Amino acid sequence: TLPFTTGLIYDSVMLKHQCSCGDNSRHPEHAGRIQSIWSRLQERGLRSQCECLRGRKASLEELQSVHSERHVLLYGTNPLSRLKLDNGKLAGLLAQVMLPCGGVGVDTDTIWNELHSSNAARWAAGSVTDLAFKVASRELKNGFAVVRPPGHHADHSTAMGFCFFNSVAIACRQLQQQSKASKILIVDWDVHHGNGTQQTFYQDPSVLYISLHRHDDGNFFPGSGAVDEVGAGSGEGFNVNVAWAGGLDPPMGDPEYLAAFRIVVMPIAREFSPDLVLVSAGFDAAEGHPAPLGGYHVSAKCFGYMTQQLMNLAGGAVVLALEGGHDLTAICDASEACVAALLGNRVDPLSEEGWKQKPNLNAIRSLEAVIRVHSKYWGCMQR
Ligand SMILES: [K+]
Ligand SMILES: [K+]
Ligand SMILES: [Zn+2]
Ligand SMILES: [Zn+2]
Numbered sequence: 001t002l003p004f005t006t007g008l009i010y011d012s013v014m015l016k017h018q019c020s021c022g023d024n025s026r027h028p029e030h031a032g033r034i035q036s037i038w039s040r041l042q043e044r045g046l047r048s049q050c051e052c053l054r055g056r057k058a059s060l061e062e063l064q065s066v067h068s069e070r071h072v073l074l075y076g077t078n079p080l081s082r083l084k085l086d087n088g089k090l091a092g093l094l095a096q097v098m099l100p101c102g103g104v105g106v107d108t109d110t111i112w113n114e115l116h117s118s119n120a121a122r123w124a125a126g127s128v129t130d131l132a133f134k135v136a137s138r139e140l141k142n143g144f145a146v147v148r149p150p151g152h153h154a155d156h157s158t159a160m161g162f163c164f165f166n167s168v169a170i171a172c173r174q175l176q177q178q179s180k181a182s183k184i185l186i187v188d189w190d191v192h193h194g195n196g197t198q199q200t201f202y203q204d205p206s207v208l209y210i211s212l213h214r215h216d217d218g219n220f221f222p223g224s225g226a227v228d229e230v231g232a233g234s235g236e237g238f239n240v241n242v243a244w245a246g247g248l249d250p251p252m253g254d255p256e257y258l259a260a261f262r263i264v265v266m267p268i269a270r271e272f273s274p275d276l277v278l279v280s281a282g283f284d285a286a287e288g289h290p291a292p293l294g295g296y297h298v299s300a301k302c303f304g305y306m307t308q309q310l311m312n313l314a315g316g317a318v319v320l321a322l323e324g325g326h327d328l329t330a331i332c333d334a335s336e337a338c339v340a341a342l343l344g345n346r347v348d349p350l351s352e353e354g355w356k357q358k359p360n361l362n363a364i365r366s367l368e369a370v371i372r373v374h375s376k377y378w379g380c381m382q383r
Contacts, residue, residue: 027111037322046340065174144338144342186277283334
């Protein structure tokens with residue numbers, strides 16, 4: 001197995017995106033998330049095995065492959081950039097929120113550092129784009145992007161949920177620009193629905209979006225991504241919401257996620273036949289996230305195995321990007337597991353006793369609802 005065919009992307013630029021209130025306690029999407037991951041990768045000796053990359057900033061043009069020109073200028077530029085912008089655009093930015101902690105925000109949760117957040121967000125997006133391009137060109141096998149802030153809630157002209165630019169969707173679009181007619185699968189295993197991703201590709205048959213998320217009948221952030229949302233127009237069939245229903249009791253974890261993979265993710269993915277797989281790799285379905293932040297019990301090994309299964313697709317062209325998840329031990333364990341798998345470590349599904357257990361009935365119900373909906377579009381789902 002060729003060495004240095006797995007990329008890692010990280011850069012200290014992304015640490016500077018911090019509220020001015022200087023308190024990681026009211027702001028779970030904090031710099032410590034990516035630093036702890038980075039060092040863990042070094043400790044367990046995985047970093048040395050990978051072609052490490054720094055990343056770079058996305059260009060405003062790259063940003064605009066997904067986001068409106070107004071969104072890009074708002075979050076992608078700084079007063080006062082060396083930028084050559086016309087006065088009409090300058091005047092627009094003159095036309096244009098306070099947080100409890102006194103820092104500036106886009107909303108309650110989503111903080112804005114006036115010096116550093118634009119560079120950090122652009123850097124997250126360009127880093128995922130760049131890592132991906134390498135995989136597309138066949139110049140790396142797969143890879144893992146250790147990035148913040150996260151991306152998957154940012155829509156065409158909306159920053160929300162800790163996200164400003166949809167790094168994964170931007171990488172998707174860029175890849176497609178650079179290799180005509182390629183087919184891209186985006187798997188989102190972050191516990192939240194990636195509303196911005198679903199909306200970006202909703203009418204687009206060239207991109208298959210599969211999200212697994214806690215849904216509970218519209219009552220978990222962000223409220224989006226019901227099972228009946230399949231895509232529209234040309235893209236009808238190419239949006240798959242594994243919308244988990246029914247809450248936290250009973251316990252949602254490994255047998256549910258493994259079952260979701262066996263039954264829905266893998267069969268639909270193979271039928272689609274993706275040229276490349278991008279993963280919105282949030283770790284907030286990991287054990288270590290209380291009720292309001294998740295409430296699930298997925299294990300690091302399971303994230304590792306899910307990574308491992310996705311490597312059977314697309315010739316192996318697989319790129320994970322960090323999304324949500326903030327319990328440091330949980331996110332570091334999961335990141336480690338995923339990077340071993342990328343390298344070519346194989347998990348022993350027989351190693352784990354709790355993986356002998358049947359998925360819970362809520363999970364079964366939830367998957368039945370997926371099958372029922374998606375039978376219309378996928379053969380593997382027919383009957
Ligand atoms: K998700
Ligand atoms: K699509
Ligand atoms: Zn603050
Ligand atoms: Zn999340």
